[PDB]
Amino acid sequence: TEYKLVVVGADGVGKSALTIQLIQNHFVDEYDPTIEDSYRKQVVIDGETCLLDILDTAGQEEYSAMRDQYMRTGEGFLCVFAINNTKSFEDIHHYREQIKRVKDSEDVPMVLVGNKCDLPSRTVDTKQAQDLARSYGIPFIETSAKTRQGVDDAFYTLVREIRKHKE
Ligand SMILES: Nc1nc2c(ncn2[C@@H]2O[C@H](COP(=O)(O)OP(=O)(O)O)[C@@H](O)[C@H]2O)c(=O)[nH]1
Ligand SMILES: [Mg+2]
């Protein structure tokens, strides 16, 4: 019943920062008398209970066996680059292609996210990102995990993309 969200993107673009900001404003306690202490934390976004995972590619995760499993399990993907990191934007296509290959699907719920939009150093223009998202047929939004600009909108939009996909 839960929606399975996966955050992907290059090291250091802000995947964890965004996900922490999302959890901070969306966690709730849920009464469940079948578990120890009778209460569990859940994340609820736009009325849906959501599971959250970050696909990390660096540090300990460089040696991981789990990359394809994250892509098979996830139902929708936040594809994150940073607006001050041209290489992170160039990396997006590979992430999208891998997800499509692993899921063997042309239609995978996805949102393109340009994070760190609070920073004054910009090397990825809004138009470059919007043209890429239009080619993919997916939404594009700029976010800042520092100021919270766009964070809720990015996750809410992904939940709606997954809801339309589930039909
Ligand atoms: N200025 C600014 N810094 C950010 C933003 N998001 C993340 N950071 C910083 O960028 C660094 C990498 O963030 P992190 O969440 O670890 O990235 P991850 O490797 O993609 O999970 C950290 O120092 C964060 O504080 C943002 O929107 N604006
Ligand atoms: Mg292993």
Side-chain angles (χ1 to χ4, degrees), residues 7-20 54-58 80 82 84 114-120 143-149 151:
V7 186
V8 309
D11 195 43
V13 296
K15 300 183 296 296
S16 291
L18 287 167
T19 301
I20 292 168
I54 297 169
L55 173 62
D56 286 297
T57 188
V80 186
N84 68 335
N115 190 45
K116 312 198 183 177
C117 71
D118 57 287
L119 289 176
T143 61
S144 169
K146 184 185 183 155
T147 69
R148 287 204 104 253
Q149 178 191 329
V151 174

Side-chain angles (χ1 to χ4, degrees), residues 28-29 31-35 38-39 41-46:
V28 301
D29 275 324
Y31 177 62
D32 189 346
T34 73
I35 77 191
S38 315
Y39 288 92
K41 287 285 186 306
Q42 280 193 336
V43 174
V44 177
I45 303 171
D46 196 34

Side-chain angles (χ1 to χ4, degrees), residues 110-125:
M110 292 196 197
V111 171
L112 182 65
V113 174
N115 190 45
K116 312 198 183 177
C117 71
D118 57 287
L119 289 176
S121 302
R122 175 184 290 272
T123 56
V124 186
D125 296 314

Side-chain angles (χ1 to χ4, degrees), residues 19-29 31-35 38-39 41-59 61-105 107-163:
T19 301
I20 292 168
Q21 283 282 26
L22 183 288
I23 292 164
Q24 183 73 254
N25 282 13
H26 295 87
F27 74 83
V28 301
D29 275 324
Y31 177 62
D32 189 346
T34 73
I35 77 191
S38 315
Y39 288 92
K41 287 285 186 306
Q42 280 193 336
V43 174
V44 177
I45 303 171
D46 196 34
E48 311 294 345
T49 299
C50 290
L51 300 181
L52 303 170
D53 282 283
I54 297 169
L55 173 62
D56 286 297
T57 188
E61 292 87 6
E62 180 168 355
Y63 313 105
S64 179
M66 302 298 299
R67 182 199 75 201
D68 287 5
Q69 292 306 151
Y70 274 74
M71 299 179 173
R72 276 197 287 275
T73 297
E75 294 172 328
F77 298 85
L78 225 54
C79 297
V80 186
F81 68 96
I83 63 144
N84 68 335
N85 180 350
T86 287
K87 190 64 238 170
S88 76
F89 176 72
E90 296 177 345
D91 286 344
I92 289 291
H93 196 71
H94 189 50
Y95 285 113
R96 177 174 167 93
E97 293 293 292
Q98 280 188 140
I99 292 162
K100 288 198 328 199
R101 184 189 74 230
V102 169
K103 299 190 76 63
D104 195 33
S105 176
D107 175 22
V108 181
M110 292 196 197
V111 171
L112 182 65
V113 174
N115 190 45
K116 312 198 183 177
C117 71
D118 57 287
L119 289 176
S121 302
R122 175 184 290 272
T123 56
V124 186
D125 296 314
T126 308
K127 183 150 203 313
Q128 287 170 266
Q130 197 101 67
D131 291 347
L132 181 58
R134 183 165 65 253
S135 183
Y136 293 165
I138 70 180
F140 166 57
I141 184 169
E142 285 199 353
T143 61
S144 169
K146 184 185 183 155
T147 69
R148 287 204 104 253
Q149 178 191 329
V151 174
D152 288 347
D153 280 323
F155 284 96
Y156 297 157
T157 299
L158 181 60
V159 167
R160 186 170 176 267
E161 295 294 297
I162 293 168
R163 179 186 293 124

